[PDB]
Amino acid sequence: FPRVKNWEVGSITYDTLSAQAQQDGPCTPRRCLGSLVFPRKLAPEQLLSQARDFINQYYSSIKRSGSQAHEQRLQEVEAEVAATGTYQLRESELVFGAKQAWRNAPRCVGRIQWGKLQVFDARDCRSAQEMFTYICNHIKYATNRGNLRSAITVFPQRCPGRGDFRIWNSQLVRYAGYRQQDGSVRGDPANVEITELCIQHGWTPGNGRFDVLPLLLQAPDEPPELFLLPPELVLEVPLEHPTLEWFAALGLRWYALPAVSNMLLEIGGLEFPAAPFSGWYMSTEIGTRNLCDPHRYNILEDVAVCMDLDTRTTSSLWKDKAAVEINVAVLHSYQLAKVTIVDHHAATASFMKHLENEQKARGGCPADWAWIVPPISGSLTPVFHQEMVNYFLSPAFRYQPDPW
Amino acid sequence: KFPRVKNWEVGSITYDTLSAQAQQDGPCTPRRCLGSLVFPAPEQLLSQARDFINQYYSSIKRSGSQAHEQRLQEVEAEVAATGTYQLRESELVFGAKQAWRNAPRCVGRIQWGKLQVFDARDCRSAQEMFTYICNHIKYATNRGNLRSAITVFPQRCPGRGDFRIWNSQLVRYAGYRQQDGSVRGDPANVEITELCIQHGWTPGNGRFDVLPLLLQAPDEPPELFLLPPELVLEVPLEHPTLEWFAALGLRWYALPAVSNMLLEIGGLEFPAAPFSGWYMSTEIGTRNLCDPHRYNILEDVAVCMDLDTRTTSSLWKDKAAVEINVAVLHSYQLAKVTIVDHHAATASFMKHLENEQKARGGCPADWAWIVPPISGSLTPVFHQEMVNYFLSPAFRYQPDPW
Numbered sequence: 001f002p003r004v005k006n007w008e009v010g011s012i013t014y015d016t017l018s019a020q021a022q023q024d025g026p027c028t029p030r031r032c033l034g035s036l037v038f039p040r041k042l043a044p045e046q047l048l049s050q051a052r053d054f055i056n057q058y059y060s061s062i063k064r065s066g067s068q069a070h071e072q073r074l075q076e077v078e079a080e081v082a083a084t085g086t087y088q089l090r091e092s093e094l095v096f097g098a099k100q101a102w103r104n105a106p107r108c109v110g111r112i113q114w115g116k117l118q119v120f121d122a123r124d125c126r127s128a129q130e131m132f133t134y135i136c137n138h139i140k141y142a143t144n145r146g147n148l149r150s151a152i153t154v155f156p157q158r159c160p161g162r163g164d165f166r167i168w169n170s171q172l173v174r175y176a177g178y179r180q181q182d183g184s185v186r187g188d189p190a191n192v193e194i195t196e197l198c199i200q201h202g203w204t205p206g207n208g209r210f211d212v213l214p215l216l217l218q219a220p221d222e223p224p225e226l227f228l229l230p231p232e233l234v235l236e237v238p239l240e241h242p243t244l245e246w247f248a249a250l251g252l253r254w255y256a257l258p259a260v261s262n263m264l265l266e267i268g269g270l271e272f273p274a275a276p277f278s279g280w281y282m283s284t285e286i287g288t289r290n291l292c293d294p295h296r297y298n299i300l301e302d303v304a305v306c307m308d309l310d311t312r313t314t315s316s317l318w319k320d321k322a323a324v325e326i327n328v329a330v331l332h333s334y335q336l337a338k339v340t341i342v343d344h345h346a347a348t349a350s351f352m353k354h355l356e357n358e359q360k361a362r363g364g365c366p367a368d369w370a371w372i373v374p375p376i377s378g379s380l381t382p383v384f385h386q387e388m389v390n391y392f393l394s395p396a397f398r399y400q401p402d403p404w
Numbered sequence: 405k406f407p408r409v410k411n412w413e414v415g416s417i418t419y420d421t422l423s424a425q426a427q428q429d430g431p432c433t434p435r436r437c438l439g440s441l442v443f444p445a446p447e448q449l450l451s452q453a454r455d456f457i458n459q460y461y462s463s464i465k466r467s468g469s470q471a472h473e474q475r476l477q478e479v480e481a482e483v484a485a486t487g488t489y490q491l492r493e494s495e496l497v498f499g500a501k502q503a504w505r506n507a508p509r510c511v512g513r514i515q516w517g518k519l520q521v522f523d524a525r526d527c528r529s530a531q532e533m534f535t536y537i538c539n540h541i542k543y544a545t546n547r548g549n550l551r552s553a554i555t556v557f558p559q560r561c562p563g564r565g566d567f568r569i570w571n572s573q574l575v576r577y578a579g580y581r582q583q584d585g586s587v588r589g590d591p592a593n594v595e596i597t598e599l600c601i602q603h604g605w606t607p608g609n610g611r612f613d614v615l616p617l618l619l620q621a622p623d624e625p626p627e628l629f630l631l632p633p634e635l636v637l638e639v640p641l642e643h644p645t646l647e648w649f650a651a652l653g654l655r656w657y658a659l660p661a662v663s664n665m666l667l668e669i670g671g672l673e674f675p676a677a678p679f680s681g682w683y684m685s686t687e688i689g690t691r692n693l694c695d696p697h698r699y700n701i702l703e704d705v706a707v708c709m710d711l712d713t714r715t716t717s718s719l720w721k722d723k724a725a726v727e728i729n730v731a732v733l734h735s736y737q738l739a740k741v742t743i744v745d746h747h748a749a750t751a752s753f754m755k756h757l758e759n760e761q762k763a764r765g766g767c768p769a770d771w772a773w774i775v776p777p778i779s780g781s782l783t784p785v786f787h788q789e790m791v792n793y794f795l796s797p798a799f800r801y802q803p804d805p806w
């Protein structure tokens with residue numbers, strides 16, 4: 001059992017939960033591959049094994065392991081797979097599995113919220129227009145006029161033979177990325193590719209660097225089709241700085257709802273290639289990574305010139321100064337627009353609290369240091385000085401190949 | 405079947421084939437990654453030595469020659485008669501350089517070839533040990549124009565105890581416990597401070613009192629030595645535009661000299677081999693001054709800046725730390741003492757990664773130590789995937805002699 005120390009306080013804990021980590025990660029005794037974004041790469045006998053495991057801790061959670069429907073629920077799954085090859089989850093199980101998968105996400109710093117998740121059951125949807133309506137209900141419910149609420153919508157489980165439901169965008173809200181004469185990009189460079197696929201599927205392109213892309217939604221086998229998002233459903237926050245008057249004039253915006261729509265949900269060995277989840281932003285995500293990454297909007301320099309900073313020498317720390325103000329603008333703007341957002345200090349402090357809860361509850365917590373520590377001011381947050389153990393638990397969210 | 409490594413800023417892809425040569429095992433398994441943990445006979449001495457000799461003769465473009473095989477035959481003969489062997493001087497110098505080159509958590513390695521190696525293997529006592537160290541500090545500091553160096557004391561050897569420097573660095577500030585249960589000075593140094601006191605040291609009462617050296621000759625108790633004040637170059641900290649900053653009375657020293665690590669070369673172990681470079685400004689500004697468990701000045705600086713410390717969303721922590729780092733850079737540049745900021749340093753580490761890929765087919769690197777403690781993704785190393793592993797020669801941690 002790995003010994004884990006916190007270097008700020010000097011406290012020691014042991015991660016006993018790691019002992020039940022199965023689906024092996026990328027690392028070996030000879031080399032650590034912890035920093036890698038995608039680890040490695042992306043007879044029904046196996047299905048039952050994962051199913052019994054999932055059902056077993058469901059009843060552990062609600063006390064009733066031993067006797068009662070715990071007994072009973074086990075055979076139905078057994079019978080259901082024997083008869084049909086796959087099985088269907090009880091609604092409560094779907095709910096429990098969805099929360100568990102979020103609980104188990106090593107890279108998520110917001111997991112103190114894992115208990116508060118609204119699960120929409122969309123396993124009875126069988127059309128692209130149906131998905132779109134399901135997505136739109138989600139977006140509307142999750143956005144909630146700016147008082148954001150964590151939400152996941154779960155579409156039908158993958159079946160052997162015949163295709164899958166699948167959202168082609170990485171998120172429900174993504175901004176356009178347009179190539180050009182110089183091969184450079186107006187808009188978001190992260191989304192240039194899906195922008196490419198949007199246009200070659202019949203989407204009329206747009207103005208500039210903040211065009212909300214359409215959804216490319218895909219029902220089984222029958223190839224994808226475009227769906228335009230209602231403007232009133234897509235909540236956005238124009239970016240202003242509380243004291244730097246010119247910041248507004250930079251014309252920056254970001255959307256309200258971070259909703260990830262390309263990850264595969266695994267509960268009890270069943271796979272949901274379409275299960276979009278949503279929460280609310282940590283401000284560094286927008287202010288530091290989206291706006292300031294060299295390969296994203298890359299605005300750092302432009303903001304520095306406006307602040308009349310000395311960009312002639314790295315040792316003026318002009319990047320650092322401009323980054324902080326871009327972050328200050330994000331927090332101020334979202335607060336002004338009354339849109340739920342959390343700063344990286346508050347978020348990491350809550351995660352520390354989440355660590356201690358999980359220590360008592362499960363004897364440890366899978367955490368990926370490199371993704372939990374914020375992208376600015378890392379050592380000024382408590383998680384920096386906290387050792388972590390990273391491993392895979394089920395239920396879980398996994399990456400998956402893209403539909404092309 | 406070598407690890408694929410991507411740079412996400414640019415889109416580069418390389419394969420770390422060097423990792424396959426990893427001569428030792430770290431803490432990670434397929435079950436779990438322990439990457440963020442801070443702390444992770446003749447026949448085996450023989451195969452270690454044989455691999456280092458192979459390395460040395462590769463580096464001088466003399467692999468497989470007569471001189472090469474002769475040296476191999478000499479080494480395994482000397483292990484037969486004495487249970488050990490001695491490095492030739494050129495082998496020692498190469499070995500110390502590789503150890504730096506091989507250190508996964510060092511962002512400064514672009515410099516690895518420029519290292520002054522002082523051979524103190526003939527050192528006979530603690531008193532002589534002290535003289536060697538004083539010369540190291542004097543050469544390395546060089547009146548503020550810092551030069552990288554290592555001094556190598558006698559290797560661990562059968563029959564005799566170890567040379568050890570008890571201090572974790574050659575220059576450290578005292579850390580005194582208080583009536584508040586508090587600490588006056590550097591809290592990281594309470595233990596060594598206590599040891600010094602109970603070994604005869606007359607303690608000070610300031611926040612920046614330079615510690616004496618506790619130096620251990622084989623099978624001897626440690627002996628206390630005071631550093632000549634004028635040997636220890638310091639920099640009072642001031643801020644280019646915040647004039648009240650100077651009144652905080654903060655200082656730091658010029659020379660970062662790590663002195664409690666073990667240098668391992670071809671299976672031989674050097675328990676005492678202090679090495680020194682020059683500071684990256686974040687070590688001082690962010691970690692030494694702002695860690696809650698170090699000098700912890702962040703809040704007092706923010707209040708002075710008249711930031712709103714009631715709420716986290718004003719980012720008072722981020723703003724104060726940025727100015728503390730500016731202060732450090734300004735002060736060192738003013739004082740004409742070598743310093744590198746985290747942007748230049750990470751930029752040069754990227755060049756090292758590129759050099760090393762051409763040279764060795766990769767480079768051992770610990771992402772979490774290489775990414776600076778502030779402004780991580782503003783630096784190019786953040787977006788670079790890395791493979792952590794152990795190569796030898798190497799610097800290793802070792803237990804405290806007490």
Ligand code: HEM
Pocket residue numbers: 098102105107108109110111113117150151152277278279280281282285342347371397
């Ligand atoms: C409610 C507030 C939430 C906050 C503040 C938050 C914050 C974050 C952040 C900052 C990341 C870093 C990933 C990156 O930068 O690419 C992340 C990752 C992640 N989050 Fe959350 N999150 C929240 C809600 C949720 C919810 C509701 C779920 C699932 C139901 C979830 C599941 C995940 C997963 C699976 C990752 C892994 C990222 C990856 O592997 O690419 N999070 N979260």
Ligand code: HEM
Pocket residue numbers: 500504507509510511512513515519552553554679680681682683684687691744749773799
């Ligand atoms: C010359 C400029 C140098 C710079 C800018 C530099 C920078 C750094 C930094 C920032 C760290 C980690 C900081 C921390 O532990 O909080 C580090 C670690 C390290 N450095 Fe360098 N260094 C330099 C010279 C050297 C030299 C000359 C050597 C040895 C000959 C060396 C060997 C090491 C080793 C072994 C570690 C990691 C040890 C540990 O993890 O505790 N460095 N370096």
Ligand SMILES: Cc1cc(N)nc(CCc2cc(F)cc(CCCN(C)C)c2)c1
Pocket residue numbers: 037110170258259260263277278279280281282285
């Ligand atoms: C749910 C949620 C909350 C929040 N605060 N932020 C997010 C966005 C971060 C994110 C979370 C996530 F789970 C997936 C992605 C996209 C994939 C990223 N890698 C593979 C390149 C992004 C998502």
Ligand SMILES: Cc1cc(N)nc(CCc2cc(F)cc(CCCN(C)C)c2)c1
Pocket residue numbers: 442512660661662665679680681682683684687
């Ligand atoms: C040589 C050198 C140059 C430079 N710029 N900075 C340093 C100090 C960094 C350092 C380098 C080192 F090798 C050891 C330590 C102390 C160990 C701390 N860990 C266990 C938490 C610190 C050393």
Ligand SMILES: C[C@H](O)[C@H](O)[C@H]1CNc2nc(N)[nH]c(=O)c2N1
Pocket residue numbers: 034035036037370371372412786787788789790
């Ligand atoms: C190379 C490195 O592992 C990679 O850039 C990771 C580091 N940590 C991260 N952390 C978060 N939250 N998001 C990211 O995209 C990354 N990128």
Ligand SMILES: C[C@H](O)[C@H](O)[C@H]1CNc2nc(N)[nH]c(=O)c2N1
Pocket residue numbers: 007384385386387388440441442772773774
């Ligand atoms: C737990 C965590 O690994 C630890 O606090 C590390 C993080 N990264 C670091 N990076 C450097 N350069 N120096 C450090 O001391 C640390 N501390």
Ligand SMILES: [Cl-]
Pocket residue numbers: 258285290
């Ligand atoms: Cl985002």
Ligand SMILES: [Cl-]
Pocket residue numbers: 660687692
């Ligand atoms: Cl230091």
Ligand SMILES: [Gd]
Pocket residue numbers: none
């Ligand atoms: Gd102006």
Ligand SMILES: [Gd]
Pocket residue numbers: 645646647
């Ligand atoms: Gd002033």
Ligand SMILES: [Zn+2]
Pocket residue numbers: 027031032033034432436437438439
């Ligand atoms: Zn690992």
